[PDB]
Each structure stands twice: as C-alpha cells, then as structure tokens.
Design a protein around this ligand. Sequence first.
Ligand SMILES: NC(=O)c1ccc[n+]([C@@H]2O[C@H](COP(=O)([O-])OP(=O)(O)OC[C@H]3O[C@@H](n4cnc5c(N)ncnc54)[C@H](O)[C@@H]3O)[C@@H](O)[C@H]2O)c1
Ligand SMILES: NC(=O)c1ccc[n+]([C@@H]2O[C@H](COP(=O)([O-])OP(=O)(O)OC[C@H]3O[C@@H](n4cnc5c(N)ncnc54)[C@H](O)[C@@H]3O)[C@@H](O)[C@H]2O)c1
Ligand SMILES: O=C(O)[C@]1(O)C[C@H](CP(=O)(O)O)[C@@H](O)[C@H](O)C1
Ligand SMILES: O=C(O)[C@]1(O)C[C@H](CP(=O)(O)O)[C@@H](O)[C@H](O)C1
Ligand SMILES: [Cl-]
Ligand SMILES: [Cl-]
Ligand SMILES: [Cl-]
Ligand SMILES: [Cl-]
Ligand SMILES: [Zn+2]
Ligand SMILES: [Zn+2]
Lengths: 390, 390
Amino acid sequence: NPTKISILGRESIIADFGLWRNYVAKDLISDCSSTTYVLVTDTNIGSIYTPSFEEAFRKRAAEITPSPRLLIYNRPPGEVSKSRQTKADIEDWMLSQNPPCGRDTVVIALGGGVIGDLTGFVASTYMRGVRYVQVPTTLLAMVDSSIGGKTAIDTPLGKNLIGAIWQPTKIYIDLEFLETLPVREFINGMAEVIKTAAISSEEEFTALEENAETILKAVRREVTPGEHRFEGTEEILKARILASARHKAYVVSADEREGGLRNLLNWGHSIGHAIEAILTPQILHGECVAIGMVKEAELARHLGILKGVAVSRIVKCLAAYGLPTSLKDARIRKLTAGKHCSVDQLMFNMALDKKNDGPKKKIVLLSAIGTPYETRASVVANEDIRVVLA
Amino acid sequence: NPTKISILGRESIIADFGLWRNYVAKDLISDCSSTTYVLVTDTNIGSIYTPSFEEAFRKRAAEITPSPRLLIYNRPPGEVSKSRQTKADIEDWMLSQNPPCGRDTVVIALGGGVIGDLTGFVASTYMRGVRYVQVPTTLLAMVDSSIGGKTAIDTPLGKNLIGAIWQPTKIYIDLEFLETLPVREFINGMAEVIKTAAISSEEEFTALEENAETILKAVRREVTPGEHRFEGTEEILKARILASARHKAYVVSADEREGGLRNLLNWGHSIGHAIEAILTPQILHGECVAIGMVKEAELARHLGILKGVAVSRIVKCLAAYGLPTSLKDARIRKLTAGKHCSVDQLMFNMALDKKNDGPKKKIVLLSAIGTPYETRASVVANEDIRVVLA
Ligand SMILES: NC(=O)c1ccc[n+]([C@@H]2O[C@H](COP(=O)([O-])OP(=O)(O)OC[C@H]3O[C@@H](n4cnc5c(N)ncnc54)[C@H](O)[C@@H]3O)[C@@H](O)[C@H]2O)c1
Ligand SMILES: NC(=O)c1ccc[n+]([C@@H]2O[C@H](COP(=O)([O-])OP(=O)(O)OC[C@H]3O[C@@H](n4cnc5c(N)ncnc54)[C@H](O)[C@@H]3O)[C@@H](O)[C@H]2O)c1
Ligand SMILES: O=C(O)[C@]1(O)C[C@H](CP(=O)(O)O)[C@@H](O)[C@H](O)C1
Ligand SMILES: O=C(O)[C@]1(O)C[C@H](CP(=O)(O)O)[C@@H](O)[C@H](O)C1
Ligand SMILES: [Cl-]
Ligand SMILES: [Cl-]
Ligand SMILES: [Cl-]
Ligand SMILES: [Cl-]
Ligand SMILES: [Zn+2]
Ligand SMILES: [Zn+2]
C-alpha cells in the first residue's frame, strides 16, 4: 500500500507507484482544498506528465463548485532556472493571472531539486506565504531534495545562498517517475542515498554496497515496451529509497532550522558545494557530492577521527555506483571544458558555507561509517582543509 | 524607565528616549551576541545617527574578543528602495564582505517602513534566515511598521506582494528620533495611530480626537536650539504611541500569520493599498490610508454595519490631524501631477489584495468606533465596493 512517513509532527510524505496518475489530484482537492492550483515544471518533464494530470484534475474538480482552476507554468532546463530572475518571473506570472493567484493558491512542484527549490521558495515569499506540494521526479529529489522544507536559489557567488525553510504540505514520492529517469540522473541521485546511510546506518551502508551491481545494471539495462526498468529489484529499490527518506525525516524533525543535528545532512557538501559552485552546470550536484564526501572522509582521517579503512570503503561504494571519487576523474575533465579548482578558489567558496559559525568553518566529520563525530558540524581549521585539497 | 512590551511570547519591544544613544549597542552585544552586525539605513538618516552609534558600538565590542564588526550599508531615498533590485544589492553586498556575512549576522534596520520592510525581508531569506532588530525612526514605524514581523518589497503590480513574516529579535522605539521627524511624516504616521484606535478603543479614539490640536501644533511649532519639540506634551505623546504599539502586539500575538484576527490591522488598507499602488510615491502610505479608512467607513455604513455619525466622526479626526479625507483633496491633486484613480484601476488593484479569499474580496468593516464587525475581514461584493468609490 502507500507507504507514509511523518515529518515535523505530520504525515506529509506519501510514497508508492503511480501516485501522479491516480492519487495526487484526488488528494490535492481534499486535503489541499483551494480555488487556485499552480503547477510548475519544465519542458522535458511537462510534455510527458502534465497532460494526464490535467485530466485527473478536471475529473476531481468536477466534484467541487465553483470548480477550482489549475494554472500551468513551463520554463527552461538546468540549474539556470535557479535564479532571482527566474523566481521573479514565476511570481510576476502568478500575480498577472485573471484573477491573480491569492494566498489560497496551492503551488505544485513537479521536477527535481531545481523545480523543487525554486517552487518551494516562490511559495515561501508569495504574498508572504502559500502552500505547495512536492512531486519529486528525480531519485535525488525523492531521497533528499523534496524533503526537509529547505528551498533556495543561487547567486553568482555560490550555491543556495538566498532562500527560506518552507515546509511542503504534501510530498509525493511516485517511484514510477524513475522509469524514465536518465542513467546519469539516477547515479547522480545515488550519492545522497549513500550519504544518508554513511551518517546513519552501517547496515544500510553495507546494503547499499551489496546492491551496487544489481541496481546499477538494472539502470543501464535497456527496457522493453511492456516491462519495468526495475523488475526483479523492485522492493530492494523501495528499501534503499525509503531508508534515506525516513532518516532525513528523523534528522529534519529534530532540528528543522539547522541549529545542530541537521548539519549532518550536509556531509560532503562543505567541500562539495565549494566544488559545485565552480563546476556547475557541467557537473551535477550528486557528482560534486561524491567527490565532496571523499575529500571530507580524507580530512576526517587526516584529523584522526575517521579510519583509513572506512575512507577507502566510502570510495569503493561510490565508484561502485558510477559516482566520481576525485576531481581528477576523466569525464569530470572532458565535461569541465577548461575549468579547474585551485585550493584558493575552493577555500574562497567554503568561506561562503552556510554552516560556518562566524569565520570558523564547520564541516561534518564521520568517526566510522554510519556514525558522526558530533551531532553537528565540527569546526575545522583552514590549514587542515587545505592539506586534504592537495 | 524603559517601557517594555511582549509580543509573540517575548519582551522584544523596548521604548524610551535616547535608546539609540545609550542602550542599543549595549543590548545588541549582550542579547544579540554575534560576530557580524550589519546596519542598513539611507543617506538622510545615516549621516545623522550612525556616527555616534559606531562609537557606542566600538565601546561595547572592546569588551568582546575577538571583537565583532559592524558593517554599514547606505542607499537612495523613498519607496524606490523597496524592490527586488534593491533587496538583491543588499544581499550581494553582504555576501561580498571579507569574510562574507554568515548565518550569525545580526542585521540592524534603521529607518522607516521602507528600511524596515526591506531589511526584515533581506534577513528572512539571507542564507535562509538571520536575526535582525528594528530601529524605527518614523512615527509610522514606531506605531505600526516595525512591529508584527511583516516584511516585503513591491513589484510593478502592487504593494507588498512579495515578502515574508520574519519576527525581529528586538524593536527599539526611541522617541528621540521624532525630534527631527518632518511635519508631513508625523501626520503621515498619525494615520496608523488613529486606525489602531478605531479598531480597538473608543476611549483611545476620543483621546486622539482631543489631542489633535495640542499635538499638531507642537509638530508645526518651530523648535529652538535647547528645547524638545514635545515639551509640555511629552507623556501625552508616549501614551498615544504606546497605545497603538501595545494593541498591535495583542493582535499580532494572537494571529501572527494573519489567519483571522490580524486582518483587522488592515482597516483602510484594502482601498488604501489600491489607491497607494497608483499614487505612490507622490502620496505617502499614511496619506493613502486616511482616504482608505474613510472610503471603508462609508462602505461599512453603506452596508448598514457602520453609523453615519461614526463615519463623519472618523473623517473629522483625520482632517483634525492634517490627513486627507478624500481622493479629491487639493494637495493630493497638486502632488499627483496628472495621475487619477478610476474605479476600474482601483477595483483591479483590489483584486490583488492579500486578504481576498480566492476571488471573494475581503475588507475590514467597523460596526462602531473601536469595534470591528467580525474578528476577520468581511467578504464584500464587488458592486458594493464600486458604489463607495463614486
Ligand atoms: N533544498 C534542498 O532540500 C536540496 C536537497 C538536495 C539537492 N538540492 C539541489 O537540487 C538541485 C539538483 O537536483 P536534481 O538532480 O533533481 O536536478 P534537476 O531538477 O535539474 O533535474 C535533473 C534533470 O532531470 C530531468 N528529469 C526530471 N525528472 C525526470 C524524469 N522522470 N525522467 C526523465 N528526465 C527527468 C530534468 O529535465 C533535468 O534535466 C541542485 O541545485 C541542488 O543544490 C537541494
Ligand atoms: N510591513 C509592515 O509591517 C508595514 C506596516 C506599515 C506600513 N508599511 C510600509 O511602510 C512604508 C512607509 O513607511 P515610512 O513612512 O516609515 O517611510 P520611509 O521609510 O520611506 O521614511 C519616510 C521618510 O522619513 C525620513 N526619515 C526617517 N526617519 C527620520 C528622522 N528621524 N528624522 C527625519 N527624517 C527621517 C526618510 O529619509 C524618508 O524620506 C510603506 O512602504 C508601507 O507599505 C509596512
Ligand atoms: O539539510 C538538508 O536537507 C541538506 O543539508 C540541504 C542541502 C542544501 P544546503 O547546503 O543549501 O542547505 C542538500 O544539498 C543536502 O543534500 C541536505
Ligand atoms: O498586520 C499588519 O501589521 C498590517 O496589516 C500590515 C500592513 C501591510 P500588508 O497589507 O502588506 O500586510 C500595514 O500597512 C498595516 O498598517 C498593518
Ligand atoms: Cl501569509
Ligand atoms: Cl540515459
Ligand atoms: Cl537558517
Ligand atoms: Cl518639515
Ligand atoms: Zn545535496
Ligand atoms: Zn499601514
């Protein structure tokens, strides 16, 4: 049946196959009663999933009277969509409706982290606040980006510098979206799953190690007209996803506004974001996170917290999934046409890390696979950060 | 002594004379411990009050070690400062510091509602959230705009359409700022004081009627080198201000996110903002609110809720203060060079009112001076709104 998970004192998370088709529209109209619904997505995703949804919506809004309206917004692909410019356009668009979208509006985010963050933020400030639901269409979004309530946009100086923490009213993890998820996006998302396990369960980490091959091959294996990309390994997949979703719910519920515990969910992101700011959009987020976790593991070991054995073990599991494990990686080179990451440019970007307490940089340190050094980010001197950035 | 008022379960409001001089800097460093303080203000206010403050700050940060830093930001005058452009610049500026401003930052808003809303908003989204304190320098800000936590910016389509509700950690009502407040700004602010009384206390309303002359004359009376613009009427003034501040605290505390009760604080703003969107920046906010309250009173009476007697009584008290009571007002004409407000343009703007439940416009209706018709905005048909816009 539909697996449900509670977050911040509430059953907002609902995962299962084909929710988009027969559930969302129904649930929206009952639980999220409103007169105006706005669906935000991009051109790729949209032309595939909005058509059938418009129908399921119309079917359900026939119940109501006066019947509610679903407005649809479609825009350009990539991380380019996460800017002040873009957020403004969605807003100008909403206000310019007839009538304009009021505080009753219910925004629907249908995409990965870009459409999720953008949409979540647009809602947090729209007339000071309107509800929205997350409809993750990418593995990375189902396991991490659509949960937590964290939203933002990017500025020329770094990742997610401006934004807000606005909790979504509903989160629909429709595994069925993975059926069309490109191979890279899948491996890309896989980084967050491994991350969550590496800071929570050693068992879950091992389980991820063992599933590496089976999964990665089902993702590359070509799929025929009438079967599922995840035949055979359907539950295994649901277990890996739920595991990460559930733990984030646990971490977010206990420290929603990142006062302490929520720092942990940022393992690999301190160096990761520093990298990303320089390699994006050529290098995806999950890709930059893998390299980040390895660099952070190395530092943990450098400081005597982590074990050499655990560090190399992290590496293996990442590479097992097709994730890059070093800024030197071949493709990371062919893709990053030119671009390079000096320790200076990196250190500079890490100065903009949203965890730094004042000038004291803070990074998540692992003492062993599935066990954090502290229940918060550890203050790490700049010289130490520099060495592990060889 | 320093009069303190609690809001949203907390003594964040502190009012008295000369707080800016000897208190703020001291209080900031103790209660608002931080390593980075950012003072936002404009050129007028700034060149007068920041110099002495830098000193009181330096005096207090000598205590601490490493000593914290106060960064100062100065920009253009008017409502022009309330835009996405401007908010972005303050942000780009903060991030571009050395080191950049982190989540520990403590933003200090030193200005009227423009510097207050802008600053409050910049803080609500800065790295998803940083603290800030309000330092109202205008009567309208001390009585209304710096309290509540409501912040925003304006877009080409209307007033405060984008923003957030971010509560300030401290609010410093330093009456001493009124010593230099231009006459118009004072009358301008006076509208909010009368509004708050008209939806709360009939006594307080009468008290405002009686003080009209005394106050208005002390505001016009020229002041000599060694005296106070408010000699003689010092307490009377403190009573009128506190009265409004306290009641907003009561209303905001009970319905922070405007789910019901907080609508009341928007009396005169439904038609008021609709006007404002068209007459600004030539016509101040308080000015547009006076006209709004009168038009809303007329509608209340039109609908049988309010009494003719009460309506004209509202008018008298407003005009008593120098506030305009009709879109026809002479100066409102000479100032609004050209501009006019058809019922269509107005009705259009009222479609963008952040109270409208769906398409159902909602306006605050008074049944008698100091007594609301409901503890929320009343849904008013469009045809009725049109008649009272003759
Ligand atoms: N705020 C948070 O909670 C949070 C958490 C994690 C990561 N992030 C952010 O997430 C962003 C990246 O997320 P992402 O990888 O989801 O990126 P994304 O939203 O850019 O999606 C990646 C690609 O997937 C395509 N796609 C979407 N769903 C598909 C489907 N069903 N089948 C086929 N193609 C599909 C899109 O067209 C797009 O090209 C980064 O900006 C990162 O900082 C934010
Ligand atoms: N979000 C809220 O809670 C809220 C509540 C009320 C009104 N408002 C908003 O407030 C804004 C207008 O507020 P305002 O009237 O304070 O405007 P403002 O901030 O533009 O200030 C008006 C003028 O006062 C001058 N000034 C400031 N303090 C002074 C002093 N001590 N002596 C001399 N000159 C001084 C400034 O240079 C400026 O020209 C509007 O945009 C309105 O929508 C918002
Ligand atoms: O708390 C969270 O949800 C995160 O730390 C949020 C970050 C984004 P942030 O560093 O901008 O907060 C995300 O990339 C990470 O995977 C999980
Ligand atoms: O709740 C409030 O604080 C207000 O309603 C907030 C409004 C601004 P808003 O209509 O943009 O919310 C302000 O002008 C009014 O004086 C009081
Ligand atoms: Cl709201
Ligand atoms: Cl592919
Ligand atoms: Cl924060
Ligand atoms: Cl003057
Ligand atoms: Zn991430
Ligand atoms: Zn106002």
